[PDB]
Ligand binder design. Structure first.
Ligand SMILES: Nc1ncnc2c1ncn2[C@@H]1O[C@H](COP(=O)(O)O[C@H]2[C@@H](O)[C@H](n3cnc4c(N)ncnc43)O[C@@H]2COP(=O)(O)OP(=O)(O)OP(=O)(O)O)[C@@H](O)[C@H]1O
Ligand code: MG
Ligand code: MG
Lengths: 138, 252, 207, 297, 214, 214, 138
């Protein structure tokens, strides 16, 4: 629990509702590009976020330590670096990363340094992708 | 003789509620006569014995009634026959008594060699758990108008509550006969994660998110979200209706 | 005059004792394990441990060659040879919940199995609820000092039965991998009276 | 006076006639049988019989206790003085045990009928499906009716003038269990003699109606005296003699019919220790002495 | 008397021996393996090993054909693995046990985890569109120390029983050990096989130990 | 009886089989090749080899057309690769294995590693701007020694099974294995195709070699 | 696993944050030209530096060896030489190297010689490029 987001707090029970709220906020009022918008992020761009998170979820799902190891923490920091990098490449990705406060959750995971915190963060991201599905498509 | 169902022995213990009080003060004092009291007594006895016999003989019921007599009822037969005759018994009692006398029951599942004395004792204490039912702990005395369904703690009713549980059971039976026959494995997932909700809630909202995620060409998400809609307001109702549906439709 | 035999049973490969028929679904646990009636914690019934230990000893002390040792240690009522008991087994409650909760893991697991048809090559997925490995079951066995001469032989047989259980299983589908156990902290201390040879009885179990 | 509180660490089988069912309390003849078996164990059965037959150690049966609420079976009052109000009907029929401090309140009326039964919750009866494994024959499935108590709950025994020998026997009875499948994993308890103060006043009280607190059979002399304005109930106390040194086989004993432990009398009688095994080679005894709780209606 | 058969199951290729669900995400591991629930170590169920070994031995004790029920296969198979036939109940001589990963430290010597995620997919042919799938597999090079208890009902069949046991271990060499074996997975090897007496000193255990170790 | 089909797979061009588990940097690699987790040695999954061989052989044997579902292929493909149809289950007579590259010492003699980096790009036909990628690829000249298990069930149609095995192998030789085959990658060759008896001896095993080597 | 960027040791978890600090410090207070001007380092030059790091990282990563061999260390010393050449050619590149400890980081890798040290160095440089793309833009 205790996953800070920037304006609110998602505990272990409250990731799916926040994810659906963020997706609705994304689905409502789509992004504005140079040409007034308006296309939305692609399924194979939230893909990259999902496999990035899973590349540590697979390594943390099967363990019993309360606090994450230095190898897992390094990979979470690297996920943060990657999500910072790819946001600069495309603006339709950066609005997804901002409106859904990925960076605050990652930083809180890196501050808690606990297994349950990262499990909650991964659950939040997975619910986010799941809710992008069934609202959009393509 | 069943083809799809369960290999359990269902029993029924139906006891009319406050019949002794219906004799002590139920009949009006002004309309008090030996002939009227005898008429009521004989009507109730004839109802029980004769009409239980005739109602079972009306069409093919797999029931082997042990005792009808008066004010009491014992039955042993097919589990689904017990379940679908409980409603027949309640509606017939309401029709014959003009919705004046309450009745309580109790159903238990037993093996083919379970102790019949233990069967009767367990069904009796379930019957008592149905007798001591109160929606709120403020009024004096119990409503007594309830049925226990395989557990002493599972005290359901015969009113709009049972109406809801049976509407849910019929809807689930109609809808969930024909799935993709592969995605149905989520049913036990739901059952074992809703067995009791006072603990880690993460997996429940996770299953909600998974149900939202499931996206193909199917019935859609009308009933796939009606499951969620009925998954919060009716928790014990959903688990009870779902377990009844599972036992009815189990390939056993 | 009364001896209590302490010790701990450690689950090694996961154990499935008993069947309590209730609350089954389509998936379900097709066979659950025995639990406490109130706390719902899994347990080893004293009858199960007693019967399996008696089985191992009877098949050991005889080898197809019950005897006086088995009858005097577990009792008898057959037709004329009524021997009362010396061992008084108890229900063994799950001790490891403080430890098992530190791993954020339940005390029981659902083992997924199947049988594959040899004619149609068609599988059949059964689920077996199982008490996870590493669970500890501290127990107590009360022994009555009816005779002071036979104590050494009785306790040698008790230790032998424990040892036979070490190379066997305790409950459920053992030959299919389940139910391996071990014993440690095996001590006997007199509870009522005073046995001067309690040292050699502890040395019997210590060995 | 001397409440013996029994705290059970395992479910118990206190069967009444068969193994598939258990009841929640054991009677005083069961406890005397257990203590006599212990005394035979340590070789002083004669002194124990002398003590119990000379009223030096007379006890009631086992009643439930919940959180320092000592319970008693619903006394068999004639209810002649309650038809004016309350519910003289099946409301006071599912009520099995009432507290012993609130008896005069119950006797005079004003105790809630519904409230007590949900308040009275001490564990629950359990099924215990067992088998006799046979190597090549078919296994023999049987079930044992058991009963597990709550955490702060057990049984309590009323004893007048506790004895050093009785204290010695109760230490031995800890490690041999009490009830049906005690050599299996069921009978197991620890006890505390636990002298009490608010309870001895109830038994130092007086009154016209006497409440029998132990399943007792009057002597042939005072049966007529005791059976006058009495509201009693009989119960057969038989079964099989539990001893390996009796009649060289498994033989039943003479069924004894005794007044239940909730019956009420106007005449105090002192019961007897009854020889129910005579054809065997040791005296099989049925403890049926009387233990009373006088009240005034 | 009771004998203990020790050995090591070494994974030649990745093994997907599991079917247990452990709260898996949508696209993280679409098929996890069975593990020790407390230690999270990968696990070879004794039921899985017993069933595959019994299938291979019962087919190779006919030979080549096995279409009957497990209780009608062969006297050797019934006396080794167990029969529940009503007329003649047979007690199994082999007591298999669930097998856990032994050389996790040796795996960490190479800075590798215990398992892996193998990405597969399926190509439809009327539309030529793929369909991925990720299955978890224990790493090739993983070692599983096992003990299988054997009980001597009579010492006139122990030599042939260990002949059959070694034969079943050899037949597992050229088959898989449960999972997507036909598609690469599940290949195992048996090493350091030995038999020792649990209590006592069996007279002819040297023949058993020389026939298990070949 | 069971037979082991040995042989070597030699890469003619670079060969890429996808599957990614960790740590794809932002200037180094965008699609790594599947590797043996312990030894880091690149491998050919048995799933991919089996799937490509089955596709090519099923397409060749049926009519030259193949649009059906795998459990409705021809009887040779069904009996050789398996079938999961409800009432008609064919047990596979082939057990493919994961195939690690064997000639790493030969590669190290030439002072090269077993994998290269291939720089590709796509050119948007509108603006003529290039989008570069970076495909890891196992270098040509790499050799993958394999072993396929053949379960000798029917003693008479083993010859037709092996003729179809050789036909599928030859179809792979005029095609690609894994990855971006139509864009240059994936070419392979087969050599030292020899079937040997897993245990015992087979009467037509000298015949099965000469229908594999020819 | 403990790099020596400047006067502050860099571990395996603070590489992203310290690279972000380095980029923001350069972005906030940039290099001043000799001819009274302001300019940054181009994306092409830092991309070439990353390519240089990608040349050696692409061969180091496909290994399980604890310590880098003599060939990898030779290539690392060559990359340090090319860093010095780039610093000597364009003063903005020298400033970019000096504000970070990219020379000090490469020297620390050369002195440690372990595989994990260079892995952390590659992580740090990748994060430098990531936060250039995020903050500097394109
Ligand atoms: N005419 C008449 N008959 C019987 N009792 C009568 C009559 N007038 C007054 N009374 C008074 O009522 C009570 C009855 O108590 P009880 O003696 O226990 O007798 C049984 C049973 O014999 C009797 N009964 C059953 N069936 C009939 C019929 N068909 N006709 C007449 N009487 C009948 O009623 C009693 C049943 O007891 P319970 O089932 O336990 O009552 P409940 O409704 O289930 O209560 P609850 O558990 O729901 O709360 C005496 O006081 C008598 O003087
Ligand atoms: Mg009634
Ligand atoms: Mg009645």
């Amino acid at each position: 629990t205790e996953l800070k987001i920037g304006n609110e707090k998602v505990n272990s029970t409250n990731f799916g509702d926040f994810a659906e709220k963020a997706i609705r906020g994304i689905n409502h009022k789509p992004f504005v590009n140079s040409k007034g918008g308006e296309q939305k992020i692609t399924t194979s761009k939230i893909r990259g976020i999902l496999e990035l998170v899973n590349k540590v979820y697979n390594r943390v799902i099967n363990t019993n330590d309360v606090e994450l190891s230095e190898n897992i923490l390094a990979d979470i920091a690297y996920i943060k670096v990657k999500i910072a990098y790819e946001s600069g490449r495309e603006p339709v990705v950066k609005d997804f990363i901002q409106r859904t406060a990925f960076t605050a959750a990652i930083t809180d995971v890196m501050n808690q340094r606990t297994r349950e915190s990262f499990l909650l963060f991964a659950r939040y991201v997975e619910s986010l992708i799941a809710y992008f599905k069934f609202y959009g498509g393509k | 003789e069943v083809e799809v169902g369960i290999n359990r022995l269902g029993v029924l213990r139906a006891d009319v509620d406050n019949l002794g009080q219906a004799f002590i003060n139920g009949i009006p004092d002004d309309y008090l006569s030996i002939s009227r009291t005898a008429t009521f007594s004989r009507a109730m006895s004839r109802f029980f014995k004769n009409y239980l016999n005739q109602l079972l003989a009306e069409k093919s019921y797999k029931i082997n009634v042990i005792y009808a007599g008066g004010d009491d009822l014992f039955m042993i037969g097919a589990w689904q026959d017990i379940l679908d005759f409980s409603i027949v018994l309640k509606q017939k009692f309401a029709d014959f008594t003009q919705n004046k006398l309450s009745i309580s029951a109790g159903i238990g599942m037993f093996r083919e060699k379970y102790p019949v004395a233990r069967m009767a004792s367990l069904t009796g204490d379930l019957e008592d758990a149905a007798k001591d039912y109160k929606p709120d702990e403020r009024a004096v005395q119990a409503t007594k108008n309830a049925v226990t369904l395989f557990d002493a703690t599972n005290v359901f009713s015969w009113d709009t509550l049972e109406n809801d549980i049976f509407v849910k059971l019929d809807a689930i039976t109609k809808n969930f006969e024909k799935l993709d026959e592969t995605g149905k494995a989520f049913i036990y997932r739901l059952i074992d994660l809703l067995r009791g909700v006072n603990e880690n809630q993460q997996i429940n909202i996770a299953r909600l998110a998974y149900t939202l995620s499931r996206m193909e060409e199917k019935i859609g998400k009308t009933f796939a979200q009606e499951l969620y809609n009925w998954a919060n307001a009716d928790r014990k109702t959903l688990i009870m209706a779902l377990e009844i549906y599972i036992l009815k439709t189990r390939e056993r | 005059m009364k001896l209590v035999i302490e010790g701990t049973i450690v689950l090694k490969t996961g154990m499935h004792i008993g069947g309590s028929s209730d609350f089954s679904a389509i998936g379900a646990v097709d066979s659950p394990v025995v639990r406490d009636t109130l706390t719902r914690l899994p347990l080893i019934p004293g009858s199960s441990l007693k019967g399996k230990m008696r089985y191992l000893l009877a098949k050991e002390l005889n080898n197809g060659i019950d005897q006086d040792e088995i009858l005097r240690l577990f009792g008898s009522s057959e037709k004329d040879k009524i021997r009362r008991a010396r061992l008084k087994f108890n229900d063994i409650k799950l001790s490891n919940l403080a430890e098992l909760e530190t791993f954020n893991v339940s005390s029981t697991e659902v083992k997924f199995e199947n049988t594959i048809n040899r004619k149609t090559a068609v599988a059949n997925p059964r689920q077996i609820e199982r008490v996870i490995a590493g669970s500890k079951f501290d127990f107590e066995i009360f022994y009555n000092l009816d005779d002071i001469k036979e104590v050494e032989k009785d306790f040698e047989n008790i230790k032998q039965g424990f040892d036979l259980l070490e190379f066997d299983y305790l409950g459920g589908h053992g030959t299919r991998g389940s139910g391996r156990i071990a014993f440690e902290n095996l001590s006997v201390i007199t509870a009522v009276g005073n046995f001067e040879k309690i040292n050699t009885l502890n040395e019997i179990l210590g060995a | 006076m001397k409440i013996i509180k029994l705290y059970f660490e395992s479910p118990v089988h206190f069967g009444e006639k068969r193994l598939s069912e258990s009841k929640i309390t054991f009677s005083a003849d069961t406890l005397f049988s257990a203590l006599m078996i212990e005394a035979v164990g340590l070789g002083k059965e004669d002194e124990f019989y002398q003590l119990a037959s000379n009223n030096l150690v007379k006890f009631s049966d086992a009643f439930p206790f919940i959180d320092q609420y000592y319970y008693i079976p619903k006394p068999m009052f004639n209810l002649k003085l309650e038809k004016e109000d309350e519910n003289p009907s099946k409301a006071f029929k599912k009520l099995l045990y009432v507290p012993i401090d609130s008896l005069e309140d119950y006797l005079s009326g004003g105790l809630d009928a519904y409230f007590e039964r949900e308040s009275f919750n001490l564990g629950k009866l359990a099924l215990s499906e067992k088998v006799q494994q046979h190597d090549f024959k078919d296994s023999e499935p049987y079930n044992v009716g058991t009963f597990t108590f709550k955490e702060n709950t057990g049984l309590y025994v009323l004893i007048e003038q506790t004895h050093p020998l009785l204290e010695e026997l109760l230490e031995n009875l800890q490690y041999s269990g009490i009830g049906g499948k005690r050599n299996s994993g069921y009978g197991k308890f620890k006890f505390e003699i636990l002298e009490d103060s608010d309870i001895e006043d109830l038994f130092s009280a007086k009154g016209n109606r006497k409440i029998l607190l132990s399943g007792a059979l009057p002597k042939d002399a005072e049966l007529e005296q005791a059976l006058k304005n009495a509201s009693y109930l009989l119960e057969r106390r038989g079964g099989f003699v539990q001893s390996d040194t009796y009649a060289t086989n498994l033989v039943k004993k003479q069924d004894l019919y005794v007044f239940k432990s909730g019956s009420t009398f106007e005449n105090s009688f002192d019961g007897d220790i009854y020889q129910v095994g005579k054809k065997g080679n040791h005296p099989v005894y049925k403890y049926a002495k009387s233990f009373f709780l006088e009240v005034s209606v």
